[PDB]
Structures are given as C-alpha cells and as structure tokens.
Amino acid sequence: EGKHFVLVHGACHGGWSWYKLKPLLEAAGHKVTALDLAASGTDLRKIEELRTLYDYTLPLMELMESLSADEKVILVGHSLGGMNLGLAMEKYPQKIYAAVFLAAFMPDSVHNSSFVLEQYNERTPAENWLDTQFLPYGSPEEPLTSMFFGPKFLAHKLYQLCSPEDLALASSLVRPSSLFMEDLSKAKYFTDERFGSVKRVYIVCTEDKGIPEEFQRWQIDNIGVTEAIEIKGADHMAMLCEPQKLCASLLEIAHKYNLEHH
Amino acid sequence: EGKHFVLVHGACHGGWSWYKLKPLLEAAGHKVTALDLAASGTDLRKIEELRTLYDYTLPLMELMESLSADEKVILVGHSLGGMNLGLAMEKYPQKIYAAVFLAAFMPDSVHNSSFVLEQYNERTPAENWLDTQFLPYGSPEEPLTSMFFGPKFLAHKLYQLCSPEDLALASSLVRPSSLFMEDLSKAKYFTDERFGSVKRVYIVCTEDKGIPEEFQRWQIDNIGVTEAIEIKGADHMAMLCEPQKLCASLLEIAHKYN
Numbered sequence: 081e082g083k084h085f086v087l088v089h090g091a092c093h094g095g096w097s098w099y100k101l102k103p104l105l106e107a108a109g110h111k112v113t114a115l116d117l118a119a120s121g122t123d124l125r126k127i128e129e130l131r132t133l134y135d136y137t138l139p140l141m142e143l144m145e146s147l148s149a150d151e152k153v154i155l156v157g158h159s160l161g162g163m164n165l166g167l168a169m170e171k172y173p174q175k176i177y178a179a180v181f182l183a184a185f186m187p188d189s190v191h192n193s194s195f196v197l198e199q200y201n202e203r204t205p206a207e208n209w210l211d212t213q214f215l216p217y218g219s220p221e222e223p224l225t226s227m228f229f230g231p232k233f234l235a236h237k238l239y240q241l242c243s244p245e246d247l248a249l250a251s252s253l254v255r256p257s258s259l260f261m262e263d264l265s266k267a268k269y270f271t272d273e274r275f276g277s278v279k280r281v282y283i284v285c286t287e288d289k290g291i292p293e294e295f296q297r298w299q300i301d302n303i304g305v306t307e308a309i310e311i312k313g314a315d316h317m318a319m320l321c322e323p324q325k326l327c328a329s330l331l332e333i334a335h336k337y338n339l340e341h342h
Numbered sequence: 343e344g345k346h347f348v349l350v351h352g353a354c355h356g357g358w359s360w361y362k363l364k365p366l367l368e369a370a371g372h373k374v375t376a377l378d379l380a381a382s383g384t385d386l387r388k389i390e391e392l393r394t395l396y397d398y399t400l401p402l403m404e405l406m407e408s409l410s411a412d413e414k415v416i417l418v419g420h421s422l423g424g425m426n427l428g429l430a431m432e433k434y435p436q437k438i439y440a441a442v443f444l445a446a447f448m449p450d451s452v453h454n455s456s457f458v459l460e461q462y463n464e465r466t467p468a469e470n471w472l473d474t475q476f477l478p479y480g481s482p483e484e485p486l487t488s489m490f491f492g493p494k495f496l497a498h499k500l501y502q503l504c505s506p507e508d509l510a511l512a513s514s515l516v517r518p519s520s521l522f523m524e525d526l527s528k529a530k531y532f533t534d535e536r537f538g539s540v541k542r543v544y545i546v547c548t549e550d551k552g553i554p555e556e557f558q559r560w561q562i563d564n565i566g567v568t569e570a571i572e573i574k575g576a577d578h579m580a581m582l583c584e585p586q587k588l589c590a591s592l593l594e595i596a597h598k599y600n
C-alpha cells in the first residue's frame with residue numbers, strides 16, 4: 081500500500097526544498113527521494129555545464145532507469161520541475177503511477193516542448209522578475225542563458241507567505257538555473273502515446289506570485305489534466321508554508337490510485 | 343552601530359545551518375554573514391582538493407583580508423568551526439571583538455594545533471561514530487582521511503533534540519569533510535601573541551552528544567577562556583534547537599566586549 085514519492089525541485093532550488101514534506105510522507109509509511117538535479121543543491125556540476133533540459137534532468141533519468149522491473153513511483157514536480165517530469169514520463173511512462181505538478185510548468189504533447197514556458201513569458205510582464213539575474217553563457221550560434229533569482233524576487237514573489245527562516249535558508253542555498261529555451265523551443269520531447277499516457281494531477285497554489293494562480297489554471301484548461309487539486313492560502317513554496325496540507329493532498333492522491341487499482 | 347557576526351559552521355555542514363539564527367540576529371539590527379567554507383554548503387570545491395586546514399578555511403580568510411581597515415567583526419565557530427576561527431584569530435587578531443566557540447573544538451597556543459582533536463579522538467571509541475564514513479584520499483607519504491557523517495550519527499549524536507524536519511534538511515545537505523589531523527599535528531600555528539590576544543567565549547551545549555559537555559568543560563578547564571557560557575537543554579545543534587537562546591547569548595557578547 082506504501083508508495084515511493086520522487087520529489088523534483090524547481091529552479092534555483094534543490095532536494096533540500098522538501099525537508100518539511102519528506103518527514104511527513106515518511107511518517108505516513110511512504111518512501112521519499114528528494115533528488116538534487118544537475119547543478120542544484122550540493123551537486124558539484126556547474127550551470128555553464130548544462131546546455132539542455134536533459135542534462136539538467138539527468139539525475140532524475142538515472143533514478144528512473146535504475147528502477148527495478150517491479151518498482152513504480154509517483155513523481156511530484158515543483159514549478160520548473162514539471163519540465164523535468166515530462167522527460168521522465170516520455171521515457172518511463174510504465175514506471176509512473178502518476179505525475180503531480182505543483183504550481184509547475186506542465187508541458188503538453190501537442191506544441192513544442194517550450195510552449196508552456198513561452199505562454200508564461202507572453203503572459204508575464206518583465207517587471208515581475210525584479211532583481212532576477214539573467215546572464216548569457218552560450219555562444220552566438222548556440223546561445224544559452226542562466227537564471228538566478230535575487231533576494232527581492234524570492235522574498236516578494238516566491239516566499240511572500242513564508243517565514244524569514246525560510247528566506248534565510250533559501251538565500252544560502254539558491255543557485256543559478258536555466259529555462260533551456262533554445263533546446264525546448266526547437267523540439268518536441270513529449271508525445272501523446274508516452275508522455276500523455278501518464279495520469280496528470282495539478283496542485284494549484286492560490287497565492288502564488290511567481291507563477292500566478294491564473295496561469296496555473298490556464299495550463300489546466302489548456303493542456304488539460306486528470307485531476308486538479310488546490311491548496312488555498314499557499315504561496316509558490318507550498319512545501320514550506322503549507323507542508324501538512326501538501327502532505328494530505330499527496331496522500332490522498334496515492335490513495336485514490338489504490339482504489340481504482342489496488 | 344550594529345555588529346558584524348561571522349558565523350562559521352562545523353564539519354559536513356554549511357552556512358545554511360544558521361538559517362534559524364541569522365534572521366534573529368538581523369532583527370536586532372546586526373549584520374550577519376553565514377559563509378560556506380571550502381567544499382561546504384554550495385561551494386563548488388571538492389573535499390579531495392583540501393590538503394590542509396588553511397585550504398578549508400580559505401573562504402573565511404578571504405573574508406577577513408577583505409575587511410576594511412577599521413572594520414571589526416565577531417567570529418562564531420561551531421564545533422570544528424572552532425579550528426577555522428583559530429587561523430583567523432592568528433592572522434587578523436586586530437579585526438576581532440571576540441571569538442565565540444559554540445560547543446566547538448577550541449585550540450590553544452600552548453601545544454600542537456591538533457592537541458584538542460587528538461584528546462577527543464582518544465576519548466571517542468570507534469562505535470560512537472556510528473555510520474560516519476571515513477575514507478582516505480591522499481598519498482601513502484601524505485595521507486588524508488575524509489569524514490562524512492551518516493544518518494544515524496546525525497540523528498542520535500548531533501540532532502537527538504532537534505526536529506525531524508531539521509534532520510531531513512541535514513541529510514539532504516551534509517557533505518564529506520575532514521579533521522585535517524596530519525596537517526594540524528605538525529606545527530603550532532597558534533601563538534599567544536596573536537591568537538591568544540583575542541578574547542575567547544565558550545558556549546557549552548549541555549545536551550551535546552557529539553562533543554559531550556564533559557569534553558567541552560575539559561577544554562575550558564585546560565586552555566582557559568575569557569567567559570564560559572552555557573545553553574541548558576541544547577544538543578549539538580544549538581542554532582537549530584535553541585536559536586532564540588543562542589541569539590540572546592550572542593547579543594550579550596556583542597554588548598559586553600566593546
């Protein structure tokens with residue numbers, strides 16, 4: 081009856097981001113892996129070393145590939161983590177009970193894989209980034225851009241409802257990331273037969289200022305989902321301001337699967 | 343008017359370990375810098391690149407060297423961080439109001455710099471390290487052992503009085519470190535002229551199981567301190583189980599000494 085939860089952090093964060101949720105899921109009798117993606121958390125790789133979404137998702141892919149024949153998991157992707165999830169779903173659809181998108185960018189198997197990120201940009205004013213740093217590290221023929229959240233963007237757009245302790249923790253751990261637009265804008269890594277075969281659950285964080293609720297709902301209404309959950313009163317970092325409510329939703333998700341199957 | 347607190351983490355930890363104390367100190371109008379030492383926290387350096395204590399403390403040394411001519415600070419070293427403090431006190435003693443040793447390994451300018459670490463190891467039976475992982479990464483003529491705390495050692499030796507959240511955070515961020523025995527056991531890097539001129543304050547954490555209070559007291563009794571303070575009920579990780587009390591204590595230190 082127990083389940084294995086693979087938690088995938090968003091941009092500039094790491095496995096450490098789930099430290100409040102991990103204990104809760106484990107106390108419920110479940111297994112939890114709070115992965116560090118490439119150049120995230122304490123992974124010694126550098127951002128200038130990553131050129132594609134795949135390079136960044138490698139730790140997730142490796143875990144998936146390493147899974148046993150009789151071993152399945154529930155993926156939970158926070159924000160950018162939803163893009164990482166897509167890659168795992170396309171390659172290992174039969175090993176995923178379901179994919180949970182927490183206030184994330186949820187790709188689709190219709191348009192280019194950059195679609196969701198594209199819509200976000202076109203629906204989000206440049207003023208919202210505040211002090212976020214966007215530095216180039218690619219080439220004129222093969223351009224690459226890094227993204228590093230600043231203290232203001234973090235405090236007023238991502239952690240607005242979190243505590244100063246949460247803010248201090250993030251400030252000592254955040255590292256530069258990337259949206260990998262160049263790579264995703266000219267490819268279609270998600271197909272309806274594979275990616276689209278995995279059950280999708282979206283968890284809306286109502287008070288999100290980084291990825292506003294309105295855009296979270298647009299994705300659900302656009303690419304569609306199997307089930308939409310909501311955590312009222314949570315900002316972008318739901319695992320930090322509402323870990324218990326997040327836990328309860330994830331437990332119910334694992335349970336609903338057991339009713340239709342187990 | 344506020345003071346500048348330089349928080350130095352212990353082995354396998356990083357600047358993130360001070361996330362509960364930092365806000366509190368700042369709320370009091372103080373400046374706080376919780377840096378990552380070499381190959382610690384998010385530092386992109388690897389432990390195998392650290393051959394001596396200096397290389398490990400480099401980040402702290404760089405911070406001191408960058409300090410203004412009339413820029414002073416308060417050093418706070420947790421556990422092993424006490425050894426990193428020694429190097430800063432020996433090189434930039436004039437730029438320090440006082441060095442605070444939080445349940446730390448506090449060196450002296452009398453014996454070899456490895457004096458305190460050797461006493462601790464002799465007193466610490468192998469079983470007490472639990473699942474801690476020790477691995478060599480040097481040459482036969484220049485051996486180097488690495489030290490990486492495991493989950494059981496953390497839970498029952500360092501965080502037994504902390505929350506499951508704190509434990510999960512640590513298990514997700516800890517990285518291999520080293521005690522740098524060889525390097526430390528070959529010279530007296532600390533002198534009473536420089537190192538000894540800096541005021542020493544030791545904060546005893548009574549419930550510490552990693553570095554027992556018995557040993558913390560022995561360091562006070564055998565090397566001497568300007569002031570001995572304690573936080574009753576705190577395990578090894580005082581900044582996690584008793585941040586408010588730690589904060590209050592640090593505030594008095596900032597007040598008392600200049």
Ligand SMILES: O=C(O)c1ccccc1O
Pocket residue numbers: 090091092158159160161290291
């Ligand atoms: O990954 C995130 O948390 C994120 C937040 C705001 C905007 C873009 C992002 O990728």
Ligand SMILES: O=C(O)c1ccccc1O
Pocket residue numbers: 352353354420421422423552553
């Ligand atoms: O740095 C620590 O926290 C520590 C704890 C126990 C034993 C040796 C150590 O360096």
Ligand SMILES: O=C(O)c1ccccc1O
Pocket residue numbers: 470472494498499
């Ligand atoms: O002190 C210990 O080494 C210890 C080890 C395992 C479980 C509980 C404990 O106190």
